[PDB]
Amino acid sequence: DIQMTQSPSSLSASVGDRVTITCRASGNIHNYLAWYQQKPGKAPKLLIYYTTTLADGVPSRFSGSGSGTDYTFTISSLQPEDIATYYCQHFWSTPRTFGQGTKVEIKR
């Protein structure tokens, strides 16, 4: 089973900033990676599935790239309503593991 190694664990960015967090599965998970945005308190929300696809409703300010083993997730201009942790989890096979999570934080 593919272990997932996402990073960085915690990034500080001011709004408007571009942001890119990456997950690198240990073993090609064949694009079968999904990204989740979780805001302190609520349950995770699906922004992107299958590396490239935005779950319906998700705005076009988030995107994800990669193939085989190394994938990426990106917020193009950090808006305050985006300050949250994001986790990826492949589905290529069970067990459906998750990234360590990236803590997006407004640079104080």
Partner: protein, 116 residues
């Protein structure tokens, strides 16, 4: 619409067996999987396992030793049972629908705190 919903003992006494219901309703219990992820506070999300519309299930090797997932065809609900629970299990439990390699719909989990 489409929804799930953890319910259950908010507090469990260590050495015991914690259990939660996940009441779905808006999709079918057989052509859909119900995934179970938990996340001890401050620590990130972790995949417990998943039960299929047929009752078969895939565990996460740390918890295989004590987790157990059932389904009540007759009540739109799925059960998750952890055992000999200890303070290392206090966390927020989530049940979610896996639909096409994605967990599109999540409950807003219920916190469970184990302690004497």
């Amino acid at each position: 619409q489409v929804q799930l919903q953890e319910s259950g003992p908010g507090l469990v006494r260590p050495s015991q067996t914690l259990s939660l219901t996940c009441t779905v309703s808006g999709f079918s219990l057989t052509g859909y999987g119900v995934n179970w992820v938990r996340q001890p506070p401050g620590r990130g999300l972790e995949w417990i396992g998943m039960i299929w519309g047929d009752g078969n299930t895939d565990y996460n090797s740390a918890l295989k030793s004590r987790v157990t997932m059932l389904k009540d065809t007759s009540k739109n609900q799925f059960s998750l049972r952890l055992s000999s629970v200890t303070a290392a299990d206090t966390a927020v439990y989530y049940c979610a629908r896996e639909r096409d390699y994605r967990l599109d719909y999540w409950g807003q989990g219920s916190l469970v705190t184990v302690s004497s």
